[PDB]
Amino acid sequence: KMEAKIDELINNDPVWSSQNESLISKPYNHILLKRLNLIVQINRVMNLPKDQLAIVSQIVELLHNSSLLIDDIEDNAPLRRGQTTSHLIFGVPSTINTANYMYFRAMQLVSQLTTKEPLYHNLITIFNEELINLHRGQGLDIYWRDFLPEIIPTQEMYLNMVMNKTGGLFRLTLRLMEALSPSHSLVPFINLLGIIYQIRDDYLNLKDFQFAEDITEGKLSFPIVHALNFTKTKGQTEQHNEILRILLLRTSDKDIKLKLIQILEFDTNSLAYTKNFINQLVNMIKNDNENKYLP
Amino acid sequence: NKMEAKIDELINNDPVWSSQNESLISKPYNHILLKRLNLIVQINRVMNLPKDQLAIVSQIVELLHNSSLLIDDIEDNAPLRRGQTTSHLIFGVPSTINTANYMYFRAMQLVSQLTTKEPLYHNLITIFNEELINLHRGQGLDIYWRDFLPEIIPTQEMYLNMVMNKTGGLFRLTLRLMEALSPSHGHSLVPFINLLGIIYQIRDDYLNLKDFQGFAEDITEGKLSFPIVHALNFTKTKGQTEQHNEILRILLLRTSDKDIKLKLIQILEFDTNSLAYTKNFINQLVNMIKNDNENKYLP
Ligand SMILES: CC(C)=CCC/C(C)=C/CC/C(C)=C/CSP(=O)(O)OP(=O)(O)O
Ligand SMILES: CC(C)=CCC/C(C)=C/CC/C(C)=C/CSP(=O)(O)OP(=O)(O)O
Ligand SMILES: C=C(C)CCOP(=O)(O)OP(=O)(O)O
Ligand SMILES: C=C(C)CCOP(=O)(O)OP(=O)(O)O
Ligand SMILES: [Mg+2]
Ligand SMILES: [Mg+2]
Ligand SMILES: [Mg+2]
Ligand SMILES: [Mg+2]
């Protein structure tokens, strides 16, 4: 009877049940109890039909939530949107696998946006290209952090890193939408929005504390990049080294975290230099009277 | 206004990526390379893809398999792979996950160098997508059963389904890509490749302990391997309560103590007779192929 069961098995597609699907989805569902608006809004110009716009939205939602699951493991984050990160509940093993599984489920949804073989290819190429960019950006962010102080990035290296890491999903959402549109490309505008988005995230992480987790993580955030480069240039060796020492401590010590922020506030004035940089990027749009970036 | 021109030149160009940066993030992958082409070569005696196309299928499968291992070793807390220190322990779990995930997309990107025919490309991508989904399903079950033990004690049937997904995934991927590219051949060889993946996994599980009675790292990992699955079901079934619980206890210690690992192996050897059951089960599967004159599995 043994041979018979093996025969049945190898001749059928692999078995997968609804219950199993549930087991593997747990780390993902956990983060769901936590961007669409932007798609809505941009559609007032792309006017994709609603059921197709929904799939796009579902694809962006899978990639985004899955990327955070992985990012929190990569950043040793204890919290995300006020709750315990999934890896601390389901373990790093299941969370990595679930997140990665969701990347491929998102991919499968791509083949359901169209049956037109020419267009499908483009949708897949876009998906593939931006996922590649996302990992390149994320890899560099991680590399600088984990090899510190081997390489201290410049503002320009940081901006290119951000174009990959944060612009990736913004560009993916948008490029899909433009290729599907039944009706000037908006990628430049979405690139700039991604950059603004990331620098703002980096700024707020320190400003709402002054958790300041970026310090505990030892992240080469926009203000840290500024401060490190500012002290190096003004030959303020000791402050330069003090910033590195605190980042390398990977500390959760509130007093130490505060010490580093005061360095950026009083010494380099990096927080105020960032605030101004963000405003300078937003003004590039507030003053886009020629509508060169805006629609 | 120069910063503005700078911001303007950037957002209006593709993101910048150097070969230097490509090397820096490829470290985890390059390390595992220092450690498959035969089975592809044989099957091609049947499929006959031109050599240049067969070399791309090969690079794809090589990228997926290697990246798969990088990830698997993090998931299994493995200190060694092919006799060498695991990449996550050298470059860290963060870079290793990211790099392995990056290589999954590099592999996907290669699917396009295989054809210029749109209908076929679409099929190659679907196969790629399908089996990667299958791989993650099996791997997800292997991991859940282990980290949540004893929430679920898988039966022999459940383990085989998990392995059909987990190990048979890459085998089927490679074969389905080749069958779809073949310009040449008979009944699909999928059932045979499924059997090969199943025999392959059970052998991996078996050897992992028989070579200790290697370092029986599957025990330290707490893996619901084929012999362990037999032992846990056999004990429940035979009323060996204390033994059933002791198997669970050892698995949950995640121990590196060789005597404790050795006690467990001898429990499988003399008490549940799981090692012999597995050896014989392997033979019986191998016998389904060898005793195949009507070629219902083999080409
Ligand atoms: C599927 C997909 C989009 C990408 C795949 C590769 C990955 C994981 C990219 C990272 C994407 C994200 C959310 C980056 C922000 S890290 P951060 O600096 O924002 O850390 P934080 O958001 O502040 O916690
Ligand atoms: C991209 C791809 C191929 C798969 C994606 C999903 C993954 C990571 C599947 C895992 C497949 C492998 C190599 C498992 C080995 S654990 P084991 O029980 O086989 O023991 P081992 O470490 O291999 O000896
Ligand atoms: C990964 C970064 C930098 C932010 C992504 O969007 P948000 O994280 O700010 O939005 P939600 O996940 O809270 O929905
Ligand atoms: C169960 C899996 C996937 C690994 C088994 O050994 P491999 O066939 O992977 O051997 P090498 O990759 O080390 O050559
Ligand atoms: Mg993070
Ligand atoms: Mg991060
Ligand atoms: Mg393993
Ligand atoms: Mg494993």
Side-chain angles (χ1 to χ4, degrees):
Chain A
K1 188 63 167 181
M2 180 273 210
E3 282 198 45
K5 292 192 187 174
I6 293 300
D7 186 83
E8 174 164 311
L9 187 57
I10 63 179
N11 280 292
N12 278 298
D13 292 327
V15 180
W16 188 249
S17 66
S18 150
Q19 292 53 56
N20 288 335
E21 187 57 25
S22 277
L23 290 190
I24 297 291
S25 302
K26 286 186 182 168
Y28 183 75
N29 292 338
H30 176 262
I31 187 156
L32 268 180
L33 327 175
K34 177 211 38 146
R35 206 121 182 172
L36 158 62
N37 184 88
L38 181 60
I39 300 182
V40 171
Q41 299 301 326
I42 297 163
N43 205 216
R44 297 168 64 168
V45 161
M46 310 310 314
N47 326 286
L48 320 184
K50 260 161 292 301
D51 287 311
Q52 187 173 63
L53 180 73
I55 291 167
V56 160
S57 201
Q58 278 167 48
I59 289 172
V60 171
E61 175 178 62
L62 282 175
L63 299 178
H64 176 61
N65 288 296
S66 295
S67 67
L68 302 176
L69 288 179
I70 281 152
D71 184 82
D72 290 325
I73 283 159
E74 295 167 339
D75 299 359
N76 199 33
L79 299 167
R80 164 73 62 185
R81 256 47 88 190
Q83 254 88 302
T84 297
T85 41
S86 300
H87 61 94
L88 289 182
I89 299 160
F90 311 94
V92 168
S94 291
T95 306
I96 296 170
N97 182 255
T98 293
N100 288 173
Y101 169 64
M102 289 314 167
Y103 285 168
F104 294 102
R105 290 276 273 181
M107 181 184 174
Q108 209 171 51
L109 281 173
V110 163
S111 64
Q112 301 171 214
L113 288 171
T114 191
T115 51
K116 296 194 305 179
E117 306 298 287
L119 175 64
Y120 170 69
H121 197 163
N122 304 312
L123 301 195
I124 283 298
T125 297
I126 289 166
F127 177 92
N128 196 3
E129 281 178 346
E130 298 303 346
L131 265 133
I132 277 159
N133 292 344
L134 246 140
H135 290 266
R136 280 175 174 177
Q138 182 79 166
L140 217 42
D141 199 27
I142 287 161
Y143 182 101
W144 293 333
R145 187 196 63 203
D146 294 351
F147 272 87
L148 194 75
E150 173 188 38
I151 300 167
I152 287 168
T154 61
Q155 188 173 86
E156 180 182 342
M157 292 165 64
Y158 170 100
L159 294 171
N160 290 324
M161 178 273 299
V162 158
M163 277 273 293
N164 277 291
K165 183 184 84 168
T166 312
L169 230 209
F170 280 119
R171 283 197 297 283
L172 173 42
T173 297
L174 181 81
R175 292 179 63 198
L176 285 176
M177 281 179 87
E178 289 186 345
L180 289 174
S181 188
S183 294
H184 67 320
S185 171
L186 297 172
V187 169
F189 173 75
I190 217 71
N191 277 160
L192 185 60
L193 167 71
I195 295 164
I196 285 165
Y197 210 84
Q198 190 59 56
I199 299 169
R200 178 192 163 80
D201 185 51
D202 291 3
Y203 178 85
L204 296 181
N205 184 276
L206 301 177
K207 212 46 187 175
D208 304 351
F209 185 75
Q210 175 180 41
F211 299 94
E213 257 299 311
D214 286 3
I215 296 172
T216 302
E217 184 195 324
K219 188 165 181 171
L220 277 297
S221 66
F222 186 91
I224 298 291
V225 171
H226 173 265
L228 284 174
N229 284 294
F230 173 96
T231 55
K232 186 194 187 194
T233 298
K234 288 294 175 304
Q236 297 184 168
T237 310
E238 171 61 276
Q239 295 88 306
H240 183 82
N241 298 347
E242 185 49 18
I243 296 172
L244 293 174
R245 291 179 199 122
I246 284 165
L247 288 169
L248 292 173
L249 281 174
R250 298 302 193 253
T251 176
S252 285
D253 192 327
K254 186 197 172 184
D255 300 336
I256 307 188
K257 297 166 129 157
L258 286 162
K259 183 175 187 307
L260 172 53
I261 289 153
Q262 81 170 198
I263 286 190
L264 260 65
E265 202 55 304
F266 302 142
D267 186 321
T268 55
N269 201 208
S270 287
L271 301 171
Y273 171 101
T274 301
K275 187 188 174 193
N276 177 269
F277 198 87
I278 293 176
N279 295 157
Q280 285 183 249
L281 296 177
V282 179
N283 293 335
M284 275 193 68
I285 289 169
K286 293 293 182 167
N287 304 336
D288 182 34
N289 299 309
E290 315 254 67
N291 273 325
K292 175 192 166 168
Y293 303 140
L294 287 171
Chain B
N1 291 296
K2 174 81 193 308
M3 181 262 247
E4 180 178 60
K6 294 166 79 71
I7 287 296
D8 172 75
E9 178 195 3
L10 177 84
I11 66 185
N12 270 290
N13 274 277
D14 286 331
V16 167
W17 190 245
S18 60
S19 61
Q20 280 61 49
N21 285 333
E22 181 65 28
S23 291
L24 291 183
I25 70 163
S26 294
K27 285 177 183 304
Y29 191 76
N30 290 324
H31 171 268
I32 188 166
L33 277 189
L34 298 171
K35 302 163 153 87
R36 290 196 293 300
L37 179 54
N38 200 52
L39 177 58
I40 284 182
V41 163
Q42 301 308 310
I43 303 133
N44 200 233
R45 307 171 87 63
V46 180
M47 312 298 163
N48 307 301
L49 323 186
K51 291 192 174 177
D52 311 314
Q53 202 179 214
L54 190 70
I56 289 177
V57 170
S58 172
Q59 301 166 57
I60 287 164
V61 173
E62 180 176 80
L63 271 169
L64 295 185
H65 182 54
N66 287 324
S67 290
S68 214
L69 307 185
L70 292 175
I71 286 295
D72 180 77
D73 289 328
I74 292 165
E75 286 163 344
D76 303 345
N77 195 209
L80 298 168
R81 164 68 68 184
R82 297 153 176 186
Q84 197 60 280
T85 303
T86 280
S87 305
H88 58 96
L89 296 180
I90 298 165
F91 319 92
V93 168
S95 281
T96 304
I97 294 168
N98 185 70
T99 297
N101 280 172
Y102 177 54
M103 297 309 184
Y104 288 166
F105 296 97
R106 299 289 284 185
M108 175 192 294
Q109 187 172 58
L110 288 186
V111 175
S112 68
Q113 289 186 33
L114 291 168
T115 322
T116 23
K117 290 167 67 291
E118 296 296 0
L120 178 55
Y121 172 76
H122 186 291
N123 294 329
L124 299 178
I125 294 297
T126 297
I127 293 169
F128 180 97
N129 200 334
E130 282 184 350
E131 299 298 359
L132 267 143
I133 277 168
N134 293 340
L135 264 346
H136 290 267
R137 284 179 172 169
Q139 183 78 336
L141 284 181
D142 202 24
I143 293 171
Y144 191 92
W145 298 338
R146 176 197 77 199
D147 294 348
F148 293 91
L149 188 72
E151 187 195 314
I152 293 171
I153 304 288
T155 57
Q156 192 182 83
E157 166 161 54
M158 302 176 251
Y159 167 94
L160 294 167
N161 287 334
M162 173 275 294
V163 166
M164 269 278 277
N165 278 291
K166 189 183 71 160
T167 316
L170 233 205
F171 282 95
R172 281 195 299 282
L173 177 17
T174 302
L175 169 55
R176 306 175 58 203
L177 284 181
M178 290 178 67
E179 280 189 352
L181 294 175
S182 159
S184 181
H185 26 282
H187 69 266
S188 180
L189 281 172
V190 171
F192 169 74
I193 230 60
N194 276 160
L195 189 62
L196 179 59
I198 285 164
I199 288 166
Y200 188 84
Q201 187 59 66
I202 294 179
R203 195 182 81 110
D204 178 40
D205 291 3
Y206 180 78
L207 296 183
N208 192 281
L209 310 169
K210 202 74 183 178
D211 301 335
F212 200 77
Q213 175 195 40
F215 10 97
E217 184 67 9
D218 287 353
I219 294 168
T220 303
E221 178 191 334
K223 190 180 188 166
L224 279 299
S225 65
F226 190 84
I228 285 289
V229 170
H230 173 272
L232 287 164
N233 287 283
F234 175 95
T235 58
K236 180 62 83 188
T237 281
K238 294 283 188 298
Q240 292 194 185
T241 304
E242 182 72 13
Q243 288 96 145
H244 178 94
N245 289 163
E246 175 66 0
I247 289 168
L248 294 175
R249 196 186 60 99
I250 292 168
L251 293 176
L252 293 160
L253 292 168
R254 301 298 196 250
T255 188
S256 294
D257 180 296
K258 77 151 254 252
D259 291 287
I260 294 177
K261 292 197 281 216
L262 206 54
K263 162 188 182 169
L264 173 57
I265 286 166
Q266 306 300 226
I267 284 169
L268 301 191
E269 180 65 58
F270 309 97
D271 179 272
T272 64
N273 307 311
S274 295
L275 301 171
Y277 175 89
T278 302
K279 184 190 181 190
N280 177 250
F281 197 94
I282 293 171
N283 290 161
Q284 284 177 296
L285 291 170
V286 157
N287 281 333
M288 288 184 65
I289 288 179
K290 279 181 184 173
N291 290 322
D292 186 55
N293 284 41
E294 305 169 292
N295 294 305
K296 71 165 82 161
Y297 292 138
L298 292 171

